[PDB]
Ligand binder design. Structure first.
Ligand SMILES: O=S(=O)(c1cc(Cl)ccc1Cl)n1cnc2ccccc21
Length: 304
């Protein structure tokens, strides 16, 4: 009925705000990115620092794993993305083509493509093997805050400070849907649900919304947290009870019951905005990360 997340480890090492945290699909690792221009790798179960991956010339806003846990992609203010071999630390490719800061990135399920979004208002699709830009979508009229592929890679969802979420056909680049509710606040995050039927979207009016994108209908809203300024990730927690997890500008992690929408737990400990959360793929473990006055990542574990 309610989880019991408790703090287990605090991970120190980044020298500026953390920007994103992600667990590897195989459960072994946590990757973090930061405004300090670095990616760090940590053990997912013990929080033990593994190594630093460097090469970007300016801060990093996002990092994402390939589905086989072998590669990372990062998005930077240096206007590039980089594809990294995690085991060796090597930069395999630098993806150049955005005309402004790159803010968000993800691999497709087959990890043969990368999608990126930028302050240049575009969504781009890149070939992983060659590192070349395949398609540029004139997607939005303001910076693109998130991009994510659906379960089979046939669709991309993007979100933007223009107030819209858009769904794109990967193969053709056509805009298939635009989603917006009754107000127009910036959309700061979007992702498809694990089963691919829904989209979870955050807006800078203190609201998370679950959409049936096929029907174009908002089915659930999650409120009670504070999110008026920063692009804060949100997650589906799948391993125990069915929860929604998000950071907050009041320095807490919020956890809601997906079905009932009630808050079930708040996690206290960070000393600045919780900008990013991630949920472990097999264990009831949450990672949270905070902005410049805190600079740490925390690992929390629950029995359900
Ligand atoms: O499949 S889901 O995306 C999902 C969400 C979470 Cl938190 C954990 C696991 C899964 Cl599988 N999903 C979307 N709506 C749902 C309603 C009931 C059960 C699952 C639902």
């Amino acid at each position: 009925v309610k989880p019991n997340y408790a703090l287990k480890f605090t991970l120190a090492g980044h020298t500026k705000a953390v920007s994103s945290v992600k667990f590897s699909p195989n459960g072994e690792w946590l990757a973090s990115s930061s405004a300090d221009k670095l990616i760090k790798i940590w053990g997912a179960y013990d929080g033990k620092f593994e190594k630093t991956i460097s090469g970007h010339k300016l801060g990093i806003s996002d990092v994402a794993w390939s589905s086989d846990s072998n590669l990372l992609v990062s998005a930077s203010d240096d206007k590039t993305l980089k594809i990294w071999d995690v085991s060796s630390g090597k930069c395999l490719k630098t993806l150049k083509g955005h005309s402004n800061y790159v803010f968000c990135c993800n691999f497709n399920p087959q990890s043969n493509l990368i999608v990126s979004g930028s302050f240049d208002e575009s969504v781009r699709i890149w070939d992983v093997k060659t590192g070349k830009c395949l398609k540029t979508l004139p997607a939005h009229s303001d910076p693109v805050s998130a991009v994510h592929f659906n379960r089979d890679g046939s669709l991309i969802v993007s979100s933007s400070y223009d107030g819209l979420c858009r769904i794109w056909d990967t193969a053709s680049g056509q805009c298939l849907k635009t989603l917006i509710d009754d107000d127009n606040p910036p959309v700061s995050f979007v992702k498809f649900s694990p089963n691919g039927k829904y989209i979870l979207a955050a807006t800078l009016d203190n609201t998370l919304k679950l959409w049936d994108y096929s029907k174009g209908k908002c089915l659930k809203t999650y409120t009670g947290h504070k999110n008026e300024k920063y692009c804060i990730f949100a997650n589906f927690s799948v391993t125990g009870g069915k929860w929604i997890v998000s950071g907050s500008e009041d320095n807490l992690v919020y956890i809601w019951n997906l079905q009932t929408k009630e808050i079930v737990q708040k996690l206290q400990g960070h000393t600045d905005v919780v900008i990013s959360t991630a949920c472990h793929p097999t264990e009831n473990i949450i990672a949270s990360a905070a902005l410049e006055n805190d600079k740490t990542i925390k690992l929390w574990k629950s029995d359900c």
